[PDB]
């Protein structure tokens, strides 16, 4: 049997994966998800993508590990610049709009948006930064808008010679090539077990059994024991309660506030009574200090 905490909330994946509008790449929308149960099997039903792309974990192994916090970054980029969404990437988007630490442990989902982000006249509500003095630091965004200067003389607020605007509007058309179609991109970043975790799948704490010698791994504690009801008054927020031997005897449950008692499974020694070997081979077996009912 095993332990899991008291999480009953459901993580809101519906609002992030589809909201009829997406933030620009230069200003990517970031949401924090925690204190809920995340069902990643329903993600396929929200966005029309092909397959996951995870680096630190596997797409089929996201419903077992329990993480502290989840970060979701959503934006829309060009078709050919999806390749720039990868660890240690180099490019305009890589160092000017979105930078990712090289130790990224998460997933990236990108899928086409030609039917919503393209207009016959031409979409212009999405912009990306073109010029920047320095490459972007990991997990850093830029919102400030100004006139970039590439000359000795100051720009003086007029876009004259040696004065540029580092905000280029994306050109999206329904007749454009595949590498130029607008694509919605969502990057999910996970935090490992550094603080009490809050996001993982809803598997019961093995439906707590009673009156049986049982193996267990309770919250990293490996052992065996017999579990029975309890008559002790554990105060509101105790998790483990020990004895004179400094070993646990009464226990709570992180999936339902219940008070339970622990005992060691019965065990004993075996003795054999025999006459002389030269006399006969018959033997008698005795179990030391055990009532003649269990055996």
């Amino acid at each position, epitope marked *: 049997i095993v332990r899991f905490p008291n999480i009953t909330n459901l993580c809101p994946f519906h609002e992030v994966f589809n909201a009829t509008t997406f933030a620009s790449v230069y200003a990517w929308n970031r949401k924090r998800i925690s204190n809920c149960v995340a069902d990643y099997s329903v993600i396929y039903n929200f966005a029309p993508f092909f397959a996951f792309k995870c680096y630190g974990v596997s797409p089929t192994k996201l419903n077992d590990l329990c993480f502290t916090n989840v970060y979701a970054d959503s934006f829309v980029i060009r078709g050919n610049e999806v390749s720039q969404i990868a660890p240690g990437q180099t490019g305009n988007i890589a160092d000017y709009n979105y930078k990712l630490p090289d130790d990224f442990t998460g997933c990236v989902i990108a899928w086409n948006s030609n039917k919503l982000d393209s207009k016959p006249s031409g979409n212009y*509500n999405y*912009l990306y930064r073109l010029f920047r003095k320095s490459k972007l630091k990991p997990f850093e965004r830029d*919102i400030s808008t100004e*006139i970039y200067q590439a000359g000795n003389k100051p720009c003086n*607020g007029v*876009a004259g010679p040696n*004065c*540029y605007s580092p*905000l280029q*509007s994306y050109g999206f058309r329904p007749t454009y090539g595949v590498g130029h179609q607008p694509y919605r991109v969502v990057v999910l970043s996970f935090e490992l077990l550094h603080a009490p975790a809050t996001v993982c799948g809803p598997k019961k704490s093995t439906n707590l059994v009673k009156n049986k010698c049982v193996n267990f791994n309770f919250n990293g504690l490996t052992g065996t024991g017999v579990l029975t009801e309890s008559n002790k008054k554990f105060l509101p927020f105790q998790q483990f309660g020990r004895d004179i031997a400094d070993t646990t005897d009464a226990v709570r449950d992180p999936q339902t506030l219940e008070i339970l008692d622990i005992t060691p499974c019965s065990f004993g020694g075996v003795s054999v009574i025999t006459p002389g070997t030269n006399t006969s081979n018959q033997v008698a077996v005795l179990y030391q200090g055990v009532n003649c009912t269990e055996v």
Partner: nanobody
Amino acid sequence: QVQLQESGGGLVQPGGSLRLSCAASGFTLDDYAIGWFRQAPGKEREGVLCISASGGSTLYADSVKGRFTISRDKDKNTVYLQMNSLKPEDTAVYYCAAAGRLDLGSGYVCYGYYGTDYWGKGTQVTVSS
């Protein structure tokens, strides 16, 4: 998400004053050029006045130069219009509009006229004459 609603108007005598304001809710564009438009019954709607968003470079039409005063406040994301010495030809259906700034030649330039992304429901301003 983005909505443009206007308030104010009515019927006033010639030479009077009125205040018109259109509130922008849910706007997310960093750089944009919002404009105000009017259309008298039987005439095409035309641009009237507009200012820049970054610093407030004011622009006016010849027919409403001086008589029309505008101010943009970023606290409420609402633009306020001041009209004084109203004249009979000013009777029209007044609208508020919002659109993003054009990006050409690597610069920040605000453009009005046509090609506006968003529009309001409009209001009626009448002069007794």
